[PDB]
Structure 1
Amino acid sequence: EIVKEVLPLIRVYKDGTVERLLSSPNVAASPEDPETGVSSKDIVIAHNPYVSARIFLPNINKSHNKLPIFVYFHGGAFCVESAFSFFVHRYLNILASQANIIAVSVDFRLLPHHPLPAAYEDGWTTLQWIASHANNTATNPEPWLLNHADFNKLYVGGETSGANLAHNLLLRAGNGNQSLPGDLKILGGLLCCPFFWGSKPIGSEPVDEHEQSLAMKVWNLACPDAPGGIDNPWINPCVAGAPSLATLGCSKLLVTITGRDEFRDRDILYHDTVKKSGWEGQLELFDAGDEEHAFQLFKPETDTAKAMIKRLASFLV
């Protein structure tokens, strides 16, 4: 008995069993990935609500300086994909080695059982957990963080909905009422093809088909009780009455887009809005080329993919 369905992403049955789109199976963490030299392990950030993660530590050939931390949130429209998939594992191995940074891939809660803002909270739980290492308030600290992490170089980011998640975290961080343990600051944000939408079609978005877009079905699954619906500031950050993008709680921000991504114009609008908002930080835009969103995870061997990774490495510093 089917209660909910957003094809091709997800089907939900009466008894809470779910069929999910699966683009790659999960793989085991590695003591040393053969191609990149990156070590990875799987850890528990919080038991309840349960939030786990894979942390990636690149080859330590020198240890004069500690390494930037990159908290990554996978794509998958809040309802599919995983922190531990073949694609994410292989991508972060490359990123961690090419950029020489520690990566933390967060397995945040998903629809159907955990509607937004669950995922957002899990992201915030992750950042608190990280900051608790910096001021020695962590209870079961991850030794890799204590030994190798530069806590003043915390970067937060992701793909599509994961990037929407990071964006939301940046706002929380730059809100005066909210702070991290030790008042740790996020240095930078990296949003790759972030999932943003709106009730009115814009740019090259098809007008007649708009109200039937997959983006709208995804959002209705993720947050049906959202006031304003598809114009809720969580999904439409450029909407009237949304918090000002001048309160983004970081100092540097890179937005990446692709030519074929559905959210290209939304992303472009987001960037321009950040620019003409008075946000004082360093703002950057990167057009990765004639590709789909997340293309670099699927085909990291292409010239286009390699150029994107090099770009990211120059940002994650």
Structure 2
Amino acid sequence: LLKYLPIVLNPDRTITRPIQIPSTAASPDPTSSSPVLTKDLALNPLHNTFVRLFLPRHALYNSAKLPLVVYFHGGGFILFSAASTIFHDFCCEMAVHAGVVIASVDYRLAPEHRLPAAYDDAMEALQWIKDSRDEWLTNFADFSNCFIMGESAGGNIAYHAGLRAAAVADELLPLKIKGLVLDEPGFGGSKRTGSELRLANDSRLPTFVLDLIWELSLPMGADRDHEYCNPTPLYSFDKIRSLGWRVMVVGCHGDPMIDRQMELAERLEKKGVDVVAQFDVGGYHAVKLEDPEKAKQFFVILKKFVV
């Protein structure tokens, strides 16, 4: 198991995180070397949640405002942070190569805070952005052009945040959401799918490791057909349709979660939502976080989508 998640299971239903996940300090000052300026802002001290802003260096050498991306990291709901190096680095590259201001949310983790905790923090992050008078937000970010995005579990979160935000859209103004970006959103269910069975001995996401994730994440008692797990009523798509939101879903064939990711893109389309789907052959789960080349190909498509 330390072979697939950097955690210990203890005989009282809790976990221990014995392996440091490397993180990167914010770098808010423009005399720093960095092509991207970062700073952390306290969100809710009771939840110990915070937001990391990424401001691309090129925003400073003009006076136009960039689309604002609200980003949620991946990690099975149970690990990582807005400041973890791999998500920090991905978000710096996205700011530069997609031309975006990024608000990356450090949401509460499971099992200590089982779902719906992190959807709750997502909504506070939106209510808090709307209300914000932060200088980087106010001088450099286009509130009219906002996208909700997440990788993996963060794509799960981004999707539920998106549904909830659709309901209260009038309440967010000056914030105007134009779309959702779901990067291999993390999804499940009680019956195995074709990819789940085909890929069952995956070398990153095997069957047991994902069973484990949903066990730690889902409310106590729940099965994998819980609505937070398995998205596919959908009266909710009518509201998303009506507001004119585009949804990008992306994944690859070498991800066990593929059939559910693709199945959700089908359901969104089938219901009249403007869906930009991008499903590749091969690769594996989170290849974009390791492969600078595959990330770059994705920024070309996201840059497109964002304008």
Q: TM-score range by the shorter chain?
A: 0.7 to 0.9
Q: Would you say the 8 A contact 1:233–1:243 is kept in 2? A: no
Q: Which amino acid aligns with 2:77?
A: F
1:312 has 2:307 as partner: no
CA contact 2:97–2:296 (8 Å) conserved in 1: no
Q: 1:68 deviation in Å?
A: 0.8
- Paired residues of 2:7 and 2:18 also in contact (CA < 8 A): yes
CA gap 1:71/1:6 in 2 versus in 1, 3 angstroms:
farther
Give the structure 2 partner of residue 136 of structure 1: none
| Offset from partner CA, 1:185-215 (integer Å, 9 cap, x none) | 3211100000111112223331896995432
RMSD: 2.8
Measured in 1, the distance between the counterparts of 2:56 and 2:302 equals 16
Find out whether 1:145 has 2:144 as its counterpart.
no
Which residue of 2 is the match for residue 203 of structure 1?
Answer: 194
Relative to structure 1, the CA distance from residue 261 to residue 212 in structure 2 (aligned partners, 3 Å threshold; closer, same or farther) is: closer
1:26 counterpart residue number: 23
| Unmatched segments (≥5 aa) in structure 2 | none
| Within-5 A mapping of 1:57-206 | 57-59=55-57, 60-133=59-132, 141-175=133-167, 180-182=171-173, 184-206=175-197
Counting aligned pairs with the same residue, the percent is 32
Structure 1 counterpart of 2:245: 251
Compared CA separation, residues 267 and 283, structure 1 to 2 (3 A): same
Distance 1:267 1:208 in 2: 15
Q: Identify which range, 256-265 or 163-172, moves more after superposition.
A: 256-265
Q: After TM superposition, give the deviation of residue 246 of structure 1 in Å.
A: 3.4
Q: 1:49, CA displacement in angstroms?
A: 2.3
Over 3 Å counting, the alpha-carbon distance change for 1:226 and 1:171 in structure 2 is: farther
Aligned twin of 1:38:
36
Give CA-to-partner distance per residue, 1:162-199, whole Å, 9 cap, x none. 000000011111226x7544374321110000011111
Structure 1 pair 208/132, CA: closer, same or farther in 2 (3 Å)? closer
In structure 2, C-alpha distance between the alignment counterparts of 1:172 and 1:132, rounded to whole Å:
18
What's the counterpart of residue 223 of structure 1? Answer: 218
CA shift in 2, pair 1:226/1:246, >3 Å: farther
Shift of 1:19: 1.6
Rounded to whole Å, the distance in 1 between the matches of 2:40 and 2:272 is 40
Q: TM-score, normalised by structure 1?
A: 0.84
Structure number having the greater helix percentage: 2
The CA deviation string for residues 102-155 of structure 1, in whole angstroms up to 9 with x for no partner, is 01111100012111111110011101111113xxxxxxx321011111101111
Q: What is the match of residue 138 of structure 1?
A: none
